[PDB]
């Protein structure tokens, strides 16, 4: 009888995982501060990794990778891409980004201005977007074509921000003339196998894309939280502004004569592999006294030439309501039971 504890009550995914583990009739939940556990579904912040792997007679497993935050925080991700030889400044799937510390606090202000001026003089599209990790849902974002308003927005705040070239020519779903972003769920187990969940979700805008107004952030921001509030067309084309893969694929076939696998997924798999392989030496628990796994949420943008772009990586992602059952069961099957066995058509794609 395997034991486990729960230290994140606000986790949508793992509560389902918890419920599932009990139903096995071979997993027993313990009080959250009891250290004789096989499995830890730990807290998001300041998880005591240092206290794992020192309980004799217990193989211990946690649901986070110590170090994975380098990929999952905005500033760190940019830094990681610029300074890693295998990703490099010349990386073709990540938007030109710059790290900007507010003046009331190294920094890349003058490097950003240097490229911004090159674009202005060269008649090239010069819209940028500012954001950070402190962006509580829909707020903390400014889209502009003027560097003055961008840098001034960042100074008014107190935390580190990033400036990222805003892709001005997204792929637009018809009917609607509307923006979208793709969410992929990736599970990395204790052996560092990288499993991509079969199902993704397109989180779509319900308002036609309008390049003449970067002020009204409803047709520009795909965040579900924003759509369910400020958009008056929320749910017109698809339920909850969520298009799944069967439909999106059918659409690409009908409208563009291409498949989801060929035009987009290949690039997604390539990016997921590149990111995770890069930090593998930093975070692998292959010879550690405890073992990690983690579920990530990769966010992608597609442009009008069918090129995929990495937006951000999430370390504690939720699922889409209709997909919770399947994915959570998968986490159990491949992440947990692999280490702790209970007594064909995988839902994952092994990258």
């Amino acid at each position: 009888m395997y034991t486990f504890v729960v230290r994140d009550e606000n986790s949508s995914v793992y509560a389902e995982v918890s419920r599932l583990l009990l139903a096995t009739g071979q997993w027993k939940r313990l009080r959250k501060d009891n250290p004789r556990f096989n499995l830890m579904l730990g807290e998001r912040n300041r998880l005591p990794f240092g206290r794992l792997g020192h309980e004799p007679g217990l193989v211990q497993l946690v649901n986070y990778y110590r170090g994975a935050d380098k990929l999952c925080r905005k500033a760190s991700l940019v830094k990681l891409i610029k300074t890693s030889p295998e990703l490099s400044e010349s990386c073709t799937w990540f938007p030109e980004s710059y790290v900007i510390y507010p003046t009331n606090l190294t920094d890349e202000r003058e490097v950003f201005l240097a490229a911004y001026n090159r674009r202005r003089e060269g008649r090239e599209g010069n819209v940028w977007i500012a954001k950070s990790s402190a962006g509580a849902k829909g707020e903390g974002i400014l889209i502009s074509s003027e560097a003055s308003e961008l840098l001034d927005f960042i100074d008014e705040q107190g935390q580190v921000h990033v400036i990222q070239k805003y892709l001005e020519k997204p792929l637009l779903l018809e009917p609607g003339h509307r923006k979208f972003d793709i969410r992929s769920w990736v599970l990395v187990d204790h052996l560092y196998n990288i499993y991509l969940y079969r199902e993704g979700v397109l989180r779509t805008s319900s308002e036609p894309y309008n390049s003449a107004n970067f002020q009204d952030k409803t047709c520009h921001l795909t965040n579900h939280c924003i759509q369910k509030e400020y958009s008056k067309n929320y749910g017109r084309y698809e339920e909850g502004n969520e298009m799944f893969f069967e439909e999106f694929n059918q659409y690409l076939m009908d409208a563009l004569n291409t498949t989801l696998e060929n035009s987009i997924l290949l690039q997604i798999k390539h990016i997921i592999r590149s990111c995770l392989m890069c930090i593998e030496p930093a975070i692998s628990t292959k010879h550690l006294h405890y073992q990690s796994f983690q579920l990530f949420g990769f966010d992608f943008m597609v442009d009008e030439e069918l090129k995929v772009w990495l937006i951000e990586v999430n370390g504690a992602p939720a699922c889409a309501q209709k997909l919770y059952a399947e994915l959570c069961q998968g986490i159990v099957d491949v992440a947990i039971s692999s280490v702790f066995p209970l007594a064909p058509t995988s839902i994952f794609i092994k990258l």
């Binding site: 250290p35 004789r36 007679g57 217990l58």
Partner: protein, 428 residues
């Protein structure tokens, strides 16, 4: 050589004490003559903990025998090992104590107590470095109960910095001599709470049930009950008697076992216990020792451990087996039932292994637990106490020796306070 001085008092104390010396003498290769005959040097390494070497070349138990009448002790002298004890260490009166705590504590006992202390002092002076004392007695009668606690009080005054340890037999109506046993036990428990470091609670109720249920003995005797006690006593004192890393002396055991000074009342357990007769020939697997040892059925305090939580546990395994297997099984028990071990005392279960097994067995396990479920014992006794005390029944036996009602009221308050203290830490 860290010496322990042994005292047995009253009928129950002397009978159980005599059996203990029989069992451990055999284990150490000492015959009724006091002359050694053993194959292994391990036997003689820490013999001086319990035995004196008075002359070439016999070993004499550092044991003092105490009673207010001569019968049981006379019988001890007749017994197989009677000649082994030092004749001067027999200290007896003639009156008896009439199953009366007050007679043992205040009247008859007071007359004889200095005589006992003279012998105790005589033994103690001859100690290169004295650890402390262990007392065997019941709480149900008068001599072991009333005079026993009196001795402990006097001993503490004379040696305030030694460890005081006792094996105390609690009464139960299932094995009962008289109705005043709850009065005597309640008065005694209060003395123990104040003045002992370690008390092993041997419940006659548990001993009986283990005989009735597990051993399939329809009519158990005191002899059957005492065989359980001598087996357990041999097991709990293994660490003191043989070379070892853990709980190797009284103070170290107390430091590991006792997180709060008043809560020092332990439930012992033994394994294996097997009904005759077919099954006895097969040796037991290490997993089997472990599982029986933590079994409530194997507990000798008649409390259900599942009703409370363990503060501390000490286990002992003898003899020839795998430490690797011993560690694995021990870790299994805690890992599978971790709710039953307080989380605020990390790693509260310590395990020892000794090579030499008990006589008649290939291997065995002794359990000593500081559980909060021990409160069930004191509760049971508190109930029986107040049932009579409400109506002041049988009190005249006590008031007649000079005690008054207040002392009874105080004793009952203190034991109810003791029960409350246990409840506190079961909830924490």
């Amino acid at each position: 050589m860290r010496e322990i001085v042994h005292i047995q008092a009253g009928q129950c104390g002397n009978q159980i004490g005599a059996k203990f010396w029989e069992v451990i003498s055999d284990e150490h290769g000492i015959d009724p003559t006091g002359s050694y005959h053993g194959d292994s040097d391990l036997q003689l390494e820490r013999i001086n903990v319990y035995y004196n070497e008075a002359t070439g070349n016999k070993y004499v138990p550092r044991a003092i025998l105490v009673d207010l009448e001569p019968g049981t002790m006379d019988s001890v002298r007749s017994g197989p090992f009677g000649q082994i004890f030092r004749p001067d260490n027999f200290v007896f009166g003639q009156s008896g104590a009439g199953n009366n705590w007050a007679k043992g504590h205040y009247t008859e006992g007071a007359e004889l107590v200095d005589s006992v202390l003279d012998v105790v002092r005589k033994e103690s002076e001859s100690c290169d470095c004295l650890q402390g004392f262990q007392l065997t007695h019941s709480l149900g009668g008068g001599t072991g109960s009333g005079m026993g606690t009196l001795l402990i009080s006097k001993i503490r005054e004379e040696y305030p910095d030694r460890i005081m340890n006792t094996f105390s037999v609690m009464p139960s109506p299932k094995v009962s001599d008289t109705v005043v046993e709850p009065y005597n036990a309640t008065l005694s428990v209060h003395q123990l709470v104040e003045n002992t470091d370690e008390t092993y609670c041997i419940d006659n109720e548990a001993l009986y049930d283990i005989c009735f249920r597990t051993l399939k003995l329809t009519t158990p005797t005191y002899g059957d009950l005492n065989h359980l006690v001598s087996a357990t006593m041999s097991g709990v004192t293994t660490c003191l008697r043989f070379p070892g890393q853990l709980n190797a002396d009284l103070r170290k055991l107390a430091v590991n076992m006792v997180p709060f000074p008043r809560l020092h009342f332990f439930m012992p357990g033994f394994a294996p216990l097997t009904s005759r007769g077919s099954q006895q020939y097969r040796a037991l697997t290490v997993p089997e020792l472990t599982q029986q040892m933590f079994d409530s059925k194997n507990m000798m305090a008649a409390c259900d451990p599942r009703h409370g939580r363990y503060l501390t546990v000490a286990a002992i395994f003898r003899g020839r087996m795998s430490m690797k297997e011993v560690d694995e099984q021990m870790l299994n028990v805690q890992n599978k039932n971790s709710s039953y071990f307080v989380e605020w005392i990390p790693n509260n279960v310590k395990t020892a292994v000794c090579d030499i097994p008990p006589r008649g067995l290939k291997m065995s396990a002794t359990f000593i637990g500081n559980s909060t479920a021990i409160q069930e014992l004191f509760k049971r006794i508190s109930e029986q106490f107040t049932a009579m005390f409400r109506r002041k029944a049988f009190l005249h036996w006590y008031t007649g020796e000079g005690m008054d009602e207040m002392e009874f009221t105080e004793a009952e308050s203190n034991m109810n306070d003791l029960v409350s203290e246990y409840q506190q830490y079961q909830d924490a």
